[PDB]
Amino acid sequence: IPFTRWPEEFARRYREKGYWQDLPLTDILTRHAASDSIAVIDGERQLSYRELNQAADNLACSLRRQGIKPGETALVQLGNVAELYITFFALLKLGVAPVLALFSHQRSELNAYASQIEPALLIADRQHALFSGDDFLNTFVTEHSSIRVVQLLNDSGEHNLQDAINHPAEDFTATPSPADEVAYFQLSGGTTGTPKLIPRTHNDYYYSVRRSVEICQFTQQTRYLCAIPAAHGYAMSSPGSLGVFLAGGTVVLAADPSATLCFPLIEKHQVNVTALVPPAVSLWLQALIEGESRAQLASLKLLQVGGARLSATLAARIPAEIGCQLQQVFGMAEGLVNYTRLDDSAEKIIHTQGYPMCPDDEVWVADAEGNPLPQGEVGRLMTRGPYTFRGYYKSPQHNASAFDANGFYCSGDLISIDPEGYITVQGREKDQINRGGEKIAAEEIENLLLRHPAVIYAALVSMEDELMGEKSCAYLVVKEPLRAVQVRRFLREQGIAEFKLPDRVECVDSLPLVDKKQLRQ
């Protein structure tokens, strides 16, 4: 499986300093293979580390019998369910590199993912709109003829994922990919017209998990509510579900981050850490005002907030109105993750997004050309490090643009750095909307809008929204009258995630030639 390697002097340095430990990610689970402490709670269901590890082997083995081999890829679309973690570890034990699609992702996204990786295996959920019938499957498995095996959650027919997990592995020995080779594929937020996949090696991904655990001081006592989409890198590795498993803690799954669902789960299971995005934090504080008992969240000792910038106003209210410590998490699926420390001054936890988790994480601030700007100046985040990648998967065209000569990645974020060395996010250069933490590639949507017969020109732009931070607005120059429902219905036919539909559509007489920079003015 081809990916951009680190130069050898970098791989050697990162091994010498102990970042790369040359262990597979399977180690996170198999160190606990003897344990009967609870690893996953999912509604009424409680899986031990022993059971989880066994489930993973059971599935890994079942797939091996169906003829899935090491070095092959897989498309996995499971939500906030135990089977996400079983499937992730099953495929890691086989040496199969998956993409973890979010439940929200639809036709266009799955097709895009399947096209780049050419998967041998598809794992999806019959509770998904696309997988309740066999119509889409028939079409999907035709277009993506690489697919040989299909396993489906909440199926009682031939392709039942349960029957595989429940089938005890006779003599199974794991064959994880080498630790300096690809383990799995993360998803970019998106700056381009097609999704870009991020190769994560065991060495790079494990270190980010291991180092995240040190900072957030996760232990066997950690009870982590995983309420955001469980397959996202923030819920997965920062420190996320894996960080919890590593530590020997417990992951509590919730279908979404509504106060309606989570407030009960936090009190019931005595959760002491969870990860949210700004709008979820807002709705939580509003739910407390609207008269939810604050004592339901007594057990909470750390609340992570990331995916998008947290207003100091919102930040300051977390200790007061909820009564736990805040951690701001500024990270990206490409690698680099900045944390506030648990011992940081209120000043840094409220007004900054921390500093990189690795001492050998390297961060300078570029001007429009690409020269270093001195501290306190605002400019483009340029970074490289032991868990920051060196190329999207099979993207020589975009990789040329995305990295400078020395292998520094531009995140398309604008940042300043304090005298104390802390990063504050000041804005964004990449053509990306941040819809309450969820990322939309403006180009992806503009291309889809231009497919519409009435649409001459398309501009997708951010607009301030108090709840979400940003909402999508589609500016269209049209042949004929076009109402928002028509645009939205049309885009849903193309088959994309709901969050990607423009919250607002406006037909205008002209757009400038699109110069989005001027359209803001």
Ligand X SMILES: Cc1c(Cl)cccc1C(=O)NS(=O)(=O)OC[C@H]1O[C@@H](n2cnc3c(N)ncnc32)[C@H](O)[C@@H]1O
Half-sphere exposure in the Cβ direction for 163 (13 Å, CA): 11
Of residues 234, 263, 355, 389, which one binds ligand X by CB under 6 A?
Answer: 234
Q: Using the rule CB under 6 A, which residue among 151, 201, 411, 462 binds ligand X?
A: 411
Whose Cβ is closer to ligand X: residue 306's or residue 385's? 306
Crossing angle (nearest 10°) for helices 135-143 and 107-117: 30
Instruction: Tell me how far CA of residue 36 lies from CA of 53, 127, 220, 222, 502, in angstroms.
Output: 11, 30, 12, 16, 47
Q: Pull the structure tokens for residue 515.
A: 């110069």
Neighbouring CB atoms inside 10 A of 142's CB total: 9
End-to-end CA distance of the chain: 46
Q: Where are the alpha helices (DSSP H) in 154-300?
A: 161-165, 202-216, 233-237, 240-247, 259-268, 278-289
- Nearest distance in Å: CB 275, ligand X: 8
Q: Where does this chain touch ligand X (CB under 6 A) — which range of 124-132, 166-174, 231-239, 397-405?
A: 231-239
Q: Map the footprint of ligand X across residues 427-456, applying CB under 6 A.
A: 428, 434, 439
Q: Judged by CB under 6 A, which of 189, 279, 385, 386 binds ligand X?
A: 189
Question: What's the gap between Cα 36 and its chain centre?
Answer: 29
- In the list 329, 357, 455, 474, the residue contacting ligand X (rule: CB under 6 A) is 329
507 vs 455: CA distance, rounded Å: 9
Closer to ligand X by CB, 77 or 352: give it.
352
When binding is defined by CB under 6 A, the residue of 199, 233, 239, 385 that contacts ligand X is: 233
Q: Which of 331, 356, 379, 391 binds ligand X (CB under 6 A)?
A: 331
The answer to the question of residue 352 lying near ligand X (CB under 6 A) is no
| Comparison of 38 and 209: residue with beta carbon closer to ligand X | 209
Residue 309 contacts ligand X per CB under 6 A:
yes
Tokens standing for 235? 């819920």
Between 177 and 411, CB nearer to ligand X: 411
CB burial of residue 369 (10 Å; 0-12, 13-18, 19+): exposed
The nearest distance, CB 332 to ligand X, in angstroms, is 4
Decide whether 333 or 458 has the Cβ nearer to ligand X: 333
Q: How far is the CB of 276 from ligand X (least distance, A)?
A: 11
At 517 the three-state DSSP class reads helix
- Residue 164's nearest CA partner among 76, 62, 57, 56 is 62
CA 228 – CA 479 distance, rounded (Å): 41
| Size of interface with ligand X, in residues (CB under 6 A) | 23
- Contact between 353 and ligand X by CB under 6 A: the answer reads yes
- Select 26 or 241, whichever has its Cβ closest to ligand X: 241
Q: Tell me the one-letter amino acid at 115.
A: S
Residue number with CB closer to ligand X (42 or 470): 470
Cβ closer to ligand X: 353 or 388? 353
Q: Compute the least distance from the CB of residue 188 to ligand X, in Å.
A: 6
Q: Considering only residues 54, 328, 388, 472, which one is a binding residue for ligand X as defined by CB under 6 A?
A: 328
Give the shortest CB-285-to-ligand X separation in angstroms: 18
Neighbours of 241 (CB within 10 A): 25
Are the C-beta atoms of 457 and 300 separated by less than 8 Å?
Answer: no
Tell me which stretch binds ligand X (CB under 6 A): 41-49, 105-113, 263-271, 328-336.
Answer: 328-336
| Chain residues that interact with ligand X, rule: CB under 6 A | 189, 233-234, 237-238, 306-309, 328-333, 337, 353, 411, 413, 425, 428, 434, 439
